[PDB]
Design a protein around this ligand. Structure first.
Ligand code: CO
Ligand code: CO
Length: 325
């Protein structure tokens, strides 16, 4: 079965534009510095990070929803709030980009989770801001497609990871959207042969970012279902390299982050409760995990800025191609 939306390759003019960041650099870093703090569930800093996300997106004229709830954990009842921002609420279909904004409660001390997921959080916001003008124009087309950003709360386990202790915000949102009924007749411009019964059917594909910011990540297609989408990430990365737009240590080297193969690895993450509801998932998470994973060294200084800027180019080009910006 083919992808429901025909995927038009990015014009060279646009590819080249999406590929040269330039002194934007300071803009991404200023964004990122807001997330480079402990973001423990329930805490003042966490609440502050959420406020910053909400305000940043409201200021861009996005519809922003705070999906708050209380849930039982091994540490007692906790408050959780997912942030859901939608460029054009009326559009039937959403390209959904996601990450989690809570940070792990680490036994040894204060944990920043710079790759996990402060970087992905900042990348989402940076995409919204850097592509704002083109996004605002796309929104007026009436073509039934929009961009949606989801910052999940409570992804991390409080104690040992288990079905009950983890993914609090994603489990909640998936169930809520699954039970919120709707149909094609109430929505703007759904695709011809699409079946819409509830809100979760409007997620055309969910692209989940996690554990990004370390040097030389390796990605694979984790889902046969979304291979047509994943392959565009492979093609975009290749075109950027052909154009010499990737930052590399020496001349005549290429990035190969997006491997053209698939792997037999199963990663439990915020995608799962959606995967059970037939949401196509692209899971942008390295394999193997960065060495700093869930250690106190997952910190600001261990981020690899050239890798981050290369990933930023790929994601901007990707969103531009999918939404035909
Ligand atoms: Co983690
Ligand atoms: Co994580």
């Amino acid at each position: 079965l083919k992808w429901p939306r025909d995927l038009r390759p990015l014009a060279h003019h646009d590819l080249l534009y999406m590929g040269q960041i330039s002194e934007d650099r300071g803009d991404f870093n200023a964004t990122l510095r807001n997330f480079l703090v402990p973001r423990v569930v329930g805490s003042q800093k966490h609440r502050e990070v959420r406020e910053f996300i909400v305000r940043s997106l409201k200021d861009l004229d996005w519809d922003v929803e705070e999906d708050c709830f209380d849930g039982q954990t091994p540490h007692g009842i906790k408050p959780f709030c997912n942030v859901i921002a939608t460029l054009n609420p009326s559009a039937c279909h959403r390209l959904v980009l996601a990450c989690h904004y809570d940070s792990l409660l680490h036994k040894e001390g204060t944990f920043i989770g710079a790759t996990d997921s402060a970087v992905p959080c900042a990348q989402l916001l940076y995409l919204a801001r850097s592509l704002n003008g083109k996004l605002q124009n796309q929104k007026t087309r009436g073509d039934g497609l929009t961009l949606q950003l989801v910052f999940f709360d409570g992804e991390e386990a409080f104690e040992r990871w288990s079905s009950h202790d983890s993914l609090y915000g994603s489990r909640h949102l998936a169930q809520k959207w699954h039970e919120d009924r709707t149909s094609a007749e109430r929505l703007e411009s759904c695709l011809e042969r699409s079946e819409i019964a509830n809100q979760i059917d409007r997620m055309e594909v969910m692209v989940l970012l996690d554990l990004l910011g370390a040097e030389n990540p390796r990605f694979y297609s984790y889902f046969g279902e979304t291979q047509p989408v994943y392959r565009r990430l492979v093609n975009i990365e290749s075109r950027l390299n052909d154009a010499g737009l990737m930052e590399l240590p020496r001349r005549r080297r290429r990035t190969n982050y997006f491997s053209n193969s698939s792997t037999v690895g199963f990663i439990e993450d915020d995608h799962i409760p959606f995967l059970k509801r037939s949401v196509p998932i692209v899971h942008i998470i390295p394999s193997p995990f960065p060495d700093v994973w869930h250690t106190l060294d997952d910190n600001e200084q261990n981020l690899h800025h050239p890798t981050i800027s290369n990933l930023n180019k790929i994601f901007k080009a990707f969103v531009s191609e999918y939404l035909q910006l």
